[PDB]
Structure 1
Amino acid sequence: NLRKVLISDSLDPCCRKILQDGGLQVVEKQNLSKEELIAELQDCEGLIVRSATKVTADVINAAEKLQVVGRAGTGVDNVDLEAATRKGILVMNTPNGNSLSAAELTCGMIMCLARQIPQATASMKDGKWERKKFMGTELNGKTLGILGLGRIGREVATRMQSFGMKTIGYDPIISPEVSASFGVQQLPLEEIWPLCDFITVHTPLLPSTTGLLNDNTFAQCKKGVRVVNCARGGIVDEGALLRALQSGQCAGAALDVFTEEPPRDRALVDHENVISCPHLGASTKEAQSRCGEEIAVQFVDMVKLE
């Protein structure tokens, strides 16, 4: 079954502990070269990654004993699913562990857009006292549009309801009855755009969600709409977002994620009305601990099957 598991990224110690409690041998090495990674995998049936380690077609094809790739996080962004499927390698992730940490960062970004706290801190640290520049907006009575009403979307909804925000949204798979149970009125996208003071995206990256916000959608928005992307780079068209920030059609944007990470185009990051993080949505001690446990349990469950 599984003898040895490699951990190629920085995880909570509890990942290794649960695996070793399950009778598995564990190696833990970070910042390994592509050649280095291939070398340490020759003894291993299991590999556990975060987002740093790139499990490409070349790494999969070279790792002969590899049976399972485990990602302590959501999606499979840094894993070639096609390459793994062709080799019969099982790819597992932790869809629940990061939900609350991503929802909390999203809520923080909404508050930061309303009051420009990051820009105000930068101003203060430059020895400036700029009261007029940083006149902000009250969230109470404003409309938040939530695109994607899965794990994270519903947690954002209930938190921002406590601020007196009206929460509307769209999800092609979630019933209006389910969304109603967490206070989100579902509408067609065309009805959402004109109502929103704030828009936040919580969808996978799919053809249908690539530029879910674009020039066509910004044209339908309230002048001065504020937008959050703590989901995946590209869901908000970065070209369309910059054009909306330049016109003032968009009053501000908060971006945890970019089409390229780190972004080589700095136009959005450098914009005075853009707040950003280097993909910190899952970067809490609690989320890293829960994902480490979630992936370790999946590995042990595989042992029980084998």
Structure 2
Amino acid sequence: LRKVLISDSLDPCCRKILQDGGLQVVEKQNLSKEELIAELQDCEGLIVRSATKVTADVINAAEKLQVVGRAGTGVDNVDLEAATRKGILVMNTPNGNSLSAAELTCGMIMCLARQIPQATASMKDGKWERKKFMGTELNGKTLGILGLGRIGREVATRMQSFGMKTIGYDPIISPEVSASFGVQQLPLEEIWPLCDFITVHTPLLPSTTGLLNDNTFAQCKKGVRVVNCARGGIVDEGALLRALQSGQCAGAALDVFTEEPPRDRALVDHENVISCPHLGASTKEAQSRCGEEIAVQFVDMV
């Protein structure tokens, strides 16, 4: 309404847009439970990234709190049940990270195709083992895109320029609409045996938990490569390890995990697995857009 607190390291545009809207802004970081509660005592708004934990205790203590903004995707650090219970509106910026997640996904596909992380590691270990490496050309290969939201769409248009056949599935996006962005929709069971590469870009739901599992992996072409830059758990982690161990899956690229940081190291340590510490939204540009989009939403409210 009048005072907003930013409790994580956000792009400076966020403060600027809120102040342009007429709001007072406090910019703090790495605050503990009581530190955050004290700052919030005169704030009607709170903007977080992922580090600040908007727990039940935080929500209940901040009496003037009306809105909780998340500069990004995934409101896991916010207690939605406690927020709904206190009449606090919860906002996020899903759109702001779209290009960054799509670019990383394409980066991962290329990394799997040419074993770039493994090659760099080999080189940094003072080795020159050309004969140990053999990559694959993306041109003429089939990329399966499960989830045809904005991220899935951006991935498709970039990989089409490589000469990849882009096929996929989304129960919301019609075959006519996907055709307009070059994605041929087929029923799931038809997708699995055709893909050389599979990339998942769906929200995490009961219907999408373990979408890639022992049964669907068995339906895949031998040597399939899997990319998960969406949500941990869409690709059943145990089933993936089994697929990598048998050779059913020739490689996997993971940005997300069921537990972050993952305590089970079997996937990360696998020689055919490349990974990142959830870097999908980690670009100067994505952070700027998220900061802007959350500040605009807060100004729209007042």
Normalised by the size of structure 2, how large is the TM-score? 0.98
Inter-partner Cα distance in structure 1 for 2:53 and 2:263: 19
The equivalent of 1:268 in structure 2 is: 267
Inter-partner Cα distance in structure 2 for 1:290 and 1:156: 19
Secondary structure of 1:208's aligned partner: coil
Q: Displacement of 1:36 after TM fit?
A: 2.0
Offset from partner CA, 1:176-223 (integer Å, 9 cap, x none): 111000000111111111101000000011111111111111010111
- Shifted more, 72-81 versus 292-301: the winner is 72-81
Secondary structure of 2:95's aligned partner: coil
Q: Displacement of 1:77 after TM fit?
A: 2.2
Inter-partner Cα distance in structure 1 for 2:58 and 2:208: 29
Q: Displacement of 1:86 after TM fit?
A: 1.2
Inter-partner Cα distance in structure 2 for 1:263 and 1:37: 28
Q: Displacement of 1:28 after TM fit?
A: 1.3
Inter-partner Cα distance in structure 2 for 1:177 and 1:210: 27
- Shifted more, 183-192 versus 79-88: the winner is 79-88
Inter-partner Cα distance in structure 1 for 2:5 and 2:259: 27
Secondary structure of 2:244's aligned partner: helix
The equivalent of 1:257 in structure 2 is: 256
Inter-partner Cα distance in structure 2 for 1:133 and 1:59: 54
Q: Displacement of 1:57 after TM fit?
A: 2.1
Secondary structure of 1:164's aligned partner: coil
Normalised by the size of structure 1, how large is the TM-score? 0.97
Inter-partner Cα distance in structure 1 for 2:62 and 2:270: 44
Q: Displacement of 1:111 after TM fit?
A: 0.1
Inter-partner Cα distance in structure 2 for 1:21 and 1:166: 47
Q: Displacement of 1:250 after TM fit?
A: 0.7
Offset from partner CA, 1:105-159 (integer Å, 9 cap, x none): 0000000000010111011001001112221110001100000000100000000
Runs of 4 or more above 2 Å deviation? none
Inter-partner Cα distance in structure 1 for 2:150 and 2:76: 18
User: 1:72-221, aligned counterparts within 5 Å?
Assistant: 72-221=71-220
Secondary structure of 1:97's aligned partner: helix
Q: Displacement of 1:59 after TM fit?
A: 1.8
The equivalent of 1:14 in structure 2 is: 13
Inter-partner Cα distance in structure 2 for 1:39 and 1:189: 51
Secondary structure of 1:211's aligned partner: coil
Inter-partner Cα distance in structure 1 for 2:299 and 2:18: 7
Q: Displacement of 1:262 after TM fit?
A: 0.7
Offset from partner CA, 1:19-38 (integer Å, 9 cap, x none): 11111111111111123222
- Shifted more, 118-127 versus 35-44: the winner is 35-44
Q: Displacement of 1:45 after TM fit?
A: 0.6
Where does the alignment leave 5 or more consecutive residues of structure 2 unmatched?
A: none
Q: Displacement of 1:247 after TM fit?
A: 0.7
User: Percent identity between the aligned chains?
Assistant: 100
- Measured on the aligned residues, the alpha-carbon RMSD in Å equals 0.9
Inter-partner Cα distance in structure 2 for 1:113 and 1:4: 47
- Shifted more, 229-238 versus 74-83: the winner is 74-83
Offset from partner CA, 1:262-304 (integer Å, 9 cap, x none): 111111111111111111111111111111111000000000x
Inter-partner Cα distance in structure 1 for 2:246 and 2:80: 40
Inter-partner Cα distance in structure 2 for 1:200 and 1:150: 13
Q: Displacement of 1:58 after TM fit?
A: 2.4
Inter-partner Cα distance in structure 1 for 2:128 and 2:115: 14
Inter-partner Cα distance in structure 2 for 1:104 and 1:27: 33
